């Protein structure tokens, strides 16, 4: 028998609503979308606005107001609820209030009988991913965070604009914390099959331009927050892509919040951090391990140690 | 010689930003999108947030922050600028305020050298379409408004849920003013090829339920605004579909703001009103005419009389 | 838990391979496509040629060379095996040959343990749908034939070309036997919301032109076969759309081979004939019933009698 | 302002017909498709079969039978005409006859007033691309051949199946002549960011397995021809993607038939060979140059020397 695939969204603010809109437009078999928000009226209005556009979609989809009960037979639970950062605030300044919000959300979600896959976007996303795994008691491979997918998308856009080359051919990652301590894989970067070192040697880009691009990646959230209050379009597309990759069993490699336990030298273990992993219908299929340059490995270790600090204080 | 297709968006609020997002996701050959707003910080932030997600799109697209000089070589100009209605404000006061804003907008656009197609969504949409045509001097067929496309989408969603049939197969229109004096084409409505009269005969639905549906359509915007502050997702998809129909030269029939001068009895002439028209690459190719029932014609003439009353004043 | 949707294709000729190609390009979550043919070299070559293009697809898909063992857990079985016709599709000789082929195919499929949905395209498609239902003993709502979907596609193309209007807005059907006894629903046809009778009265089309268009629909297959040897592109798309509507649970109304039992004047009963029905994840959800004009009802009854007599002689 | 993008297809065999089909299904705005074949009946039949499925397509498209006269205002001309291999023949046996055919076709097209972009697929594709350039006297950037895009697609499918990873993450090329002298960029290959050398070290792939995969790439065409008479699905998708990337001004890097005059050492110059280049609205924006291993450079220079040996004999 054929099945009805169900996604429950928890948190109907800018990020969640953008994700839901994008998913209705570009849908890899999501038959039911259930929206949950502690602000009941916001969720109701978003459900209405999404349903009023069905005539313009490629496919019809069931979009419903829901409660935690709906998670019982959900295949995916997307969590975007929590406080976002205000001007002058880091993502780590949200750890305490957002962890308390996630203790409550994860209890309800677990008590309903949910046994699908978690997709976490709330900040700080790596620590919130670890918290989801611990509170839920779920296997490590059924808990996914968006990690550095958004930072990587920003990096690839900036490089695409610099070289006037489609983002599809920009093979570079942001790894580490989804935050101030991230780093770019400059030494492993290629444009199609042409290494970045050849572009540097040819004077088509400079090392300080690389430093500036990485700093723009790091500061992008702060800039967009100053300009329009919060970021939601790019993260909405990233979540949509993760969801479709899961439902489609696409076995695609993405730089997500991945649980490391021996990879990248093993100096730091048992944390979630921005790193490449294979995604499929069962969740994470494998957390990859590849050699990165010594300086880049020191940056990775420093970022992972920063994360481990917060994990140890709880 | 292949060309670069350029769309300029004026007004980066909820409607305009939602349209731009939807267009980048489902893009029928827009190479360059230019976003303009009197609040330039908002426009900058939306440009950045839209660009940061390029890695997740099917196609790359140039999204830019611009000025009115960018309209010179634009192919389409989408206008979503102006005020949305507030409590205690009739359609007359918004007509006044928004026509005064459009004078400035259209003056700058036309002075830039623009000679493309106008797509208008600011409310009251039919009157603002008339105003755009009068201020711009453009041929009537080069000025399009969204008309009752959103009301028709709401109607077809309601009917699809009632009969549990895909919106694709709900053949019914909302016509007249985009507002309180609109009406449904009940007597000409079909579900696939089965007339609504048959469903009525079989107790599949009742006249009361039909009145209920029409009033749901009339009050949808008020409900959504109560619940979440504004509507923008469904209107964004509608505008995206219009723009793609134009660039794709699809010759598709839609219930837009159409210029009547003889159709539907011809008792009211020389106004834009929600009615079916064929849309193609050069704009409106034909405003159609078909027989509606006498009671529905009474409703149509009343709505057109209302719109003509507001126009003649100025 | 999430599942892998499995489609088995029996018959890897022009029609089957066209359908498989179109499905790989436009895929509503088919995870596994299995191809079977009594000519195993042909099935293998098609599997290889379809897999060699995965790089260019939106989504990866597992394309497999199969045996009947693969039907055990298949969700849909598409049958396009059988002799293609230079002369009459509904020859009693062709009926006999393809009935003998279907006996073997259905026996092997059913002995595999399959319990999904049959989608039949082999000719004569209405009688082959009947034979599939009889040999398999499946519920009638789990046996689908393509019926007059192809004839309706041709009709809507011809009308779209006549009026220079998108096929989207052409609301007309071909009904009755997929072949020489079919008829068009001229008296119920609409262009968008405009009845065809209004176009006739305005001189934009004539009765003779309607007759000629219907004869073009009837002679299309013969002409295409004369020119290029066989037809497979339009029918491949029709099969693809049926499959995607089923897996997407879209509740869409399609003119398929439907099991008639009282509808349309309850004269002929218990045969498969071209008629509109609601398609969903469950199979056929309902055969629709609406009033046709007396002349068209007579055409329909004559077509049904044609079919029943050919079933008798089998 | 907005235009109708016109593609003329010359050669309506399996390759051309598959490309046309795929294009109608996945269309980056091609408003008019014109089909030319010296066998007028085959072209007519293909036009009819393609048009009879418009109702199932996302967008309507104008498909017409035509003559050389129709290239006058064409934006793109795709050439798929000429002899195919058949069992026992290499692709280099066909040079003489196909060069004669191409002389005829190019002369007619150029005489028609066409000044757009050629896209060449007929075999041997590198030599036929060179011949198109020479006979047409067009700028080099106006002439595109499919080169090793098909070989690369086969390679990426084989590696995707071996590692069970999406083709999207397989970064490897086939370069050199589309034929028996090609080679794979093993030393520069990555699965996402993970070099192939690490998979070899970890025993997840072996040197003999790389040898075998390249041999499979080289013998794929012979095997598929033996099994079903000819290859056309994978090549059709490749052509479709080139066309959509041109019209979409996507600036994508593809391994196509590129004109070399200094790259990859100065050894062989002034020929077309399988190599990466940037494709955009104007044609070829830039032929890339990147370092490959010394043994692979030897292979590249031997392949190029063979192609030069053929070009000099004429
Ligand atoms: N790359 C990434 O992962 C990104 C992370 N982001 C974070 O995502 C989260 C949401 O951001 P925004 O949408 O802009 O914020 P928002 O102000 O729009 O609020 C999101 C929603 O969460 C709701 N909520 C709060 N508590 C609960 C609860 N217990 N159950 C259900 N709903 C609840 C709340 O009512 C609100 O509607 C923040 O933590 C952001 O920092 C935002 C941008 C990118
Ligand atoms: N056609 C339809 O069906 C509907 C029409 N809608 C109307 O669309 C318009 C925009 O709606 P929202 O996005 O929600 O409102 P909004 O406040 O969110 O955005 C309106 C934008 O217009 C900007 N603006 C104001 N004046 C000017 C100016 N002189 N020049 C340039 N920019 C200016 C302004 O800065 C703001 O960003 C309103 O008139 C709505 O009533 C909204 C909903 C549906
Ligand atoms: N429903 C519709 O609208 C249409 C129906 N069509 C019919 O579809 C069928 C196939 O058409 P084509 O592909 O062009 O013909 P084809 O000869 O190209 O393909 C038929 C395939 O079926 C194979 N086959 C034969 N017997 C068996 C068997 N016992 N088991 C498995 N495979 C077998 C056979 O080897 C061949 O590959 C014919 O009956 C057509 O008449 C064709 C056009 C439209
Ligand atoms: N990666 C690649 O580039 C590949 C190249 N391929 C080659 O593409 C070409 C076509 O392959 P197929 O479609 O299978 O062969 P086909 O015989 O099926 O079709 C070729 C068509 O070209 C027609 N034709 C011949 N001369 C002219 C002319 N002067 N004007 C117009 N039409 C003409 C001819 O009538 C025929 O219909 C062959 O040369 C193949 O070797 C096929 C596979 C892949
Ligand atoms: O022209 P309308 O009335 O707006 O309907 C358009 C819709 O009709 C359809 O063609 C379906 O029509 P049918 O139900 O008659 O088959 C859809 O594809 C299309 O979106
Ligand atoms: O594996 P990555 O680095 O995430 O890149 C994924 C992208 O690479 C591509 O496969 C293109 O690869 P190439 O540049 O090597 O041709 C895109 O299709 C895909 O979106
Ligand atoms: Ca740039
Ligand atoms: Ca015509």
Numbering used by the authors:
A (entry chain P), B (entry chain A), C (entry chain C), D (entry chain B): 1 to 314
What text appears in the publication on this structure?
B. burgdorferi dispenses with the use of thiamin as a cofactor and relies on lactate dehydrogenase (BbLDH) to convert pyruvate to lactate for balancing NADH/NAD+ ratios. BB_0087 (BbLDH) comprises 316 residues and is annotated as the sole LDH in the genome of B. burgdorferi. Biochemical analyses reveal that BbLDH behaves similarly to other LDHs, interconverting pyruvate and lactate through oxidation/reduction of NADH/NAD+. BbLDH forms a homo-tetramer or a dimer of dimers, wherein each monomer comprises eight α-helices and five β-strands and contains binding sites for oxamate, NADH, and FBP.
The crystal structures of BbLDH with and without FBP were determined via X-ray crystallography to a resolution of 2.1 Å. Both structures were determined in the presence of NADH and the pyruvate analog oxamate (OXA). Interestingly, FBP binding does not change the overall structure of the BbLDH tetramer to any appreciable extent, with the FBP-bound tetramer superimposing on the apo-tetramer with an RMSD of 0.230 Å. Within the BbLDH tetramer, the four NADH/oxamate binding sites (one per subunit) are highly similar, as are the two FBP binding sites (one per dimer), with the only major difference being the relative position of the Gln85-Arg91 loop adjacent to the NADH/oxamate binding site. In addition, mutation of the key residue His171 to Ala completely abolished the FBP-mediated allosteric activation on BB_0087 as this residue forms eight hydrogen bonds with FBP (four on each chain) to stabilize the interaction between BbLDH and FBP. LDH subunit conformations can be classified as either relaxed (R)- or taut (T)-state, with the allosteric regulator FBP favoring the R-state. However, in BbLDH, FBP does not result in the tetramer-wide conformational conversion from the low-substrate affinity T-state to the high-substrate-affinity R-state, largely because the FBP-minus structures are already in a primarily R-state conformation. The structural insensitivity to FPB may be a result of the high oxamate concentrations used in both crystallization conditions, which will favor the R-state conformation. The two FBP-bound BbLDH dimers within the tetramer are practically identical, except for the relative position of the A-loop. Hence, in BbLDH, the A-loop is conformationally variable regardless of the presence of FBP.
